[PDB]
Design a protein around this ligand. Sequence first.
Ligand SMILES: *[C@@H]1O[C@H](CO)[C@@H](O[C@@H]2O[C@H](CO)[C@@H](O[C@@H]3O[C@H](CO)[C@@H](O)[C@H](O)[C@@H]3O)[C@H](O)[C@H]2NC(C)=O)[C@H](O)[C@H]1NC(C)=O
Ligand SMILES: *[C@@H]1O[C@H](CO)[C@@H](O[C@@H]2O[C@H](CO)[C@@H](O)[C@H](O)[C@H]2NC(C)=O)[C@H](O)[C@H]1NC(C)=O
Ligand SMILES: CCCCCCCCCCCCCCCC(=O)O
Ligand SMILES: CCCCCCCCCCCCCCCC(=O)O
Ligand SMILES: CCCCCCCCCCCCCCCC
Ligand SMILES: *[C@@H]1O[C@H](CO)[C@@H](O)[C@H](O)[C@H]1NC(C)=O
Ligand SMILES: CCCCCCCCCC
Ligand SMILES: CCCCCCCCCC
Ligand SMILES: CCCCCC
Ligand SMILES: CCCCCC
Ligand SMILES: CCCCCC
Ligand SMILES: CCCCCC
Lengths: 68, 67, 330, 88
Amino acid sequence: MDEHSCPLEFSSYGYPREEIVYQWKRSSVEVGDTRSWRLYQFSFVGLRNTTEVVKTTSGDYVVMSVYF
Amino acid sequence: DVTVILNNLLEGYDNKLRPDIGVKPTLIHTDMYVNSIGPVNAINMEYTIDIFFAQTWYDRRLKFNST
Amino acid sequence: MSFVKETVDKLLKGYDIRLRPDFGGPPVCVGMNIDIASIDMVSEVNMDYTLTMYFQQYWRDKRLAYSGIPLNLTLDNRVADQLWVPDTYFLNDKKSFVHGVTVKNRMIRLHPDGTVLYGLRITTTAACMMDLRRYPLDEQNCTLEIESYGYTTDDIEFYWRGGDKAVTGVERIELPQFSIVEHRLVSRNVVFATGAYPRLSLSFRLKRNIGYFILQTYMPSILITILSWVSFWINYDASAARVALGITTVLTMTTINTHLRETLPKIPYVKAIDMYLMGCFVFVFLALLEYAFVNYIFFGRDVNAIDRWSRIVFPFTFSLFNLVYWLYYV
Amino acid sequence: MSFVKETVDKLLKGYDIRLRPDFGGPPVCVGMNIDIASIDMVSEVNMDYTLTMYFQQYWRDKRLAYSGIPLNLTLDNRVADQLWVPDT
Ligand SMILES: *[C@@H]1O[C@H](CO)[C@@H](O[C@@H]2O[C@H](CO)[C@@H](O[C@@H]3O[C@H](CO)[C@@H](O)[C@H](O)[C@@H]3O)[C@H](O)[C@H]2NC(C)=O)[C@H](O)[C@H]1NC(C)=O
Ligand SMILES: *[C@@H]1O[C@H](CO)[C@@H](O[C@@H]2O[C@H](CO)[C@@H](O)[C@H](O)[C@H]2NC(C)=O)[C@H](O)[C@H]1NC(C)=O
Ligand SMILES: CCCCCCCCCCCCCCCC(=O)O
Ligand SMILES: CCCCCCCCCCCCCCCC(=O)O
Ligand SMILES: CCCCCCCCCCCCCCCC
Ligand SMILES: *[C@@H]1O[C@H](CO)[C@@H](O)[C@H](O)[C@H]1NC(C)=O
Ligand SMILES: CCCCCCCCCC
Ligand SMILES: CCCCCCCCCC
Ligand SMILES: CCCCCC
Ligand SMILES: CCCCCC
Ligand SMILES: CCCCCC
Ligand SMILES: CCCCCC
């Protein structure tokens, strides 16, 4: 009876927040016909979009993530 | 026409450096289209996903005027 | 000898891979052919199938036209590096490769009219969903979709060369569990707001063969269910015998269930075989509950009424359940 | 704007990838950081474990020194093929 929010997150590897900044263009992200997806254990409830800043030894990086 | 323009843009343009190296951050607009969220392999705590990932930005060095 | 050499030398120069044939002209029409060598394995767990095939494209290029040489030229496959080819690719691919031994399994052929035939030996793990709601009594609808990554229909067009004879070698395929029933070719254009992209589709319909399950899944379940009904003819005072028979039939059905799922595909998906096994489990459970009632009412509190009616109801109800199951799922 | 360009150009020119920093000098000390992104699996049967990490190495090289550019130069990754790096 478990529900999960699996993330998919990406960012620059070498370029910190002061060099390259990312932004969601419009409408966040698009999904096709969910009936065509290869999910049998689970069912897709809905996704969402997030942007934050992560601090590491190299610097601060803009991390863009999508939760399913 | 297309060949000369194709070869002309490569003059200079050190690709070592990002656009606006000393001016400002390079703004990149990203779009994602999820073809399918593949099977969720709970044994390894992972899941497959197929995406069309399209990123766009601005590089003034690549400007060329033509039809 | 030398005339052929200088002919190909002049052919190679002046040729730009970065530009397609007739860049300012109409779209180049690409005919496509397939010869399937072996469908190696079809997986329900991953919902995909590996397919080894001889893919062939076929397109006219004016730049690669030569005259005075009636013999067809089968150049070295490495020559394909220097020649333009379509951006064809498979949309439902998960992983694919081209065989490298002994040399890269690739071929390029020129013709005196300037036509190009480009063949590759591709092993691709294509993806197709599988409606396993009726497993093992199911038929799958698996497809290979072939499209151009960048070009629209205005720049390149795809069609099946040879029409219905485009794909061959299907008769040479003998899958270990499936039986190919039909294959279909569809050439169309997927239209978006920006423009229309060409697409081809090779769709096989695969029927599953059930004789494995009929002999090691269904027949054992039916015979254990009948051996459970044997309890109703045992004398009502034989508590040890009837309880042992009922509980051991329940244990045997549990064993069949637990060891079956070890062999079927690892998918938490509800299937028809699961319904059949659950129904047989419920029937043996009710068979033991019947003796619970019998022992309490008569011994605990001229065959008795409960056994008399059970002897007809249980076979009759199980036959009705089988009828509904086989009619609904077939 | 092109100052960084020709600065990096002269930095790479005359660079000897063969030799370590201070080839005739004392040994060069290499500092190391690790950021464990995850430990994917630990296998008792194989007696091993998978490990994903950001592995970073710090070292001082006088050939790659620049002035008049008060900013840390993050370069394209392919430049790593053109500079000396430890054989870790
Ligand atoms: C280029 O990289 C250098 C080195 O990473 C940056 O210099 C460092 O800047 C940070 C602040 O952004 C300094 O941190 C602070 O130092 C004081 C003094 O120890 C300490 O009390 C604070 O808690 C904090 O750690 C840091 O000391 C300084 N130097 C070093 C060697 O780390 C530099 O800012 C970067 N960017 C530019 C434009 O140069
Ligand atoms: C060289 O290849 C061409 C095209 O593949 C061949 O042209 C065909 O040849 C067959 C048999 O020789 C004929 O039945 C066809 O009518 C020809 N045209 C087409 C469009 O198929 C040509 O014959 C080959 N050269 C040979 C065999 O010497
Ligand atoms: C969901 C099934 C629950 C079964 C619970 C076990 C009951 C089996 C024994 C019942 C004995 C008969 C009791 C009623 C006798 C009577 O009505 O006079
Ligand atoms: C599982 C369904 C089949 C069994 C149907 C059982 C029908 C039983 C009818 C007899 C009920 C009366 C039993 C008590 C008789 C008595 O008074 O001793
Ligand atoms: C569905 C594939 C065909 C399987 C044919 C199975 C034949 C089994 C023969 C059973 C004979 C039982 C004899 C019992 C009495 C000795
Ligand atoms: C996605 O990002 C855009 C831009 O930041 C934002 O307008 C939108 O509301 C976000 N999506 C959701 C789920 O709100
Ligand atoms: C979950 C599958 C249930 C199948 C029917 C159970 C047997 C009913 C017999 C009256
Ligand atoms: C899989 C559908 C099984 C339906 C069972 C209905 C009960 C029949 C016996 C009374
Ligand atoms: C399942 C057995 C029911 C008997 C009711 C008297
Ligand atoms: C009394 C005998 C009934 C048999 C039903 C198959
Ligand atoms: C094929 C199912 C047979 C069941 C007989 C009771
Ligand atoms: C005994 C009846 C069996 C019905 C199978 C469809």
